[PDB]
């Protein structure tokens, strides 16, 4: 995010970082359960990618987090790789996450809920702070 | 480098699809939701993360970072997957697995 600010660590406890095999960040995702993560379909997640939970900083020689293996990926069959429509994917953990003050789930809406134009919402991530 | 080692946040307003097409036109489909153009923007590496809004005192996932300004302009809206249009699929998948 460009023009955002640093979060209080632990304050967005559902936020996860997806890491490839080399081992570095290629997308974020969100915990909905101790067993599942929602992310975008275009991220191209595979079973060799790893989910990282409880993480604040990316340069620690070592920090206290949770690296979770992926058992199966559920891309939405409606996903259109040209149009980018129906951009969601579910990740089924092969080892439930261990909820705590820093790792927990976000709530999911209903299909009939209304989120009106004008609502002040919040987005988080580790993407670039400047193009 | 321009990547943050520390988790970043930002507040941004939701837009109507009506409004978002002013910018993106036809690229905007029913299963998409735009936010921003207010001086902040999701940018490379933010893909797949959440766009949450507070309902009944709890944060609810409304969007998933999907695409946006090829230059991450703060004047242009970010496009998110509309969770409301995809939730029946989530829940059903959850129900069977």
């Amino acid at each position: 995010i460009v023009n955002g600010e640093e979060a209080v660590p632990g304050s967005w406890p559902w936020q996860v970082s997806l890491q490839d095999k080399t081992g570095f960040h290629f997308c974020g995702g969100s915990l909905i359960n101790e067993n599942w993560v929602v992310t975008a379909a275009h991220c191209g997640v595979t079973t060799s990618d790893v989910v990282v939970a409880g993480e604040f900083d990316q340069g620690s020689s070592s920090e206290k987090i949770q690296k979770l293996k992926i058992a199966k990926v559920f891309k939405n069959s409606k996903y259109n790789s040209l149009t980018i429509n129906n951009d969601i994917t579910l990740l089924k953990l092969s080892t439930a996450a261990s909820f705590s003050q820093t790792v927990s789930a976000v709530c999911l809406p209903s299909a009939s809920d209304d989120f009106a134009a004008g609502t002040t919402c919040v987005t988080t991530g580790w993407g670039l702070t400047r193009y | 480098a321009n990547t943050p080692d520390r988790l970043q946040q930002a507040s941004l307003p939701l837009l109507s699809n009506t409004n978002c097409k002013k910018y993106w036109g036809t690229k905007i489909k029913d299963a998409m939701i735009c936010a921003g153009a207010s001086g902040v923007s999701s940018c490379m590496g933010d893909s797949g993360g959440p766009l949450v809004c507070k309902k009944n005192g709890a944060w609810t996932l409304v969007g998933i970072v999907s695409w946006g300004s090829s230059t991450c302009s703060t004047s242009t809206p970010g496009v998110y997957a509309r969770v409301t249009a995809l939730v029946n699929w989530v829940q059903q998948t959850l129900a069977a697995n």
């Binding site: 632990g10 304050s11 406890p13 820093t102 927990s104 976000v106 | 005192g57 709890a58």
Partner: peptide, 8 residues
Amino acid sequence: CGVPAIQP
């Protein structure tokens, strides 16, 4: 279900 223990 969506209430951080550490408030944002």
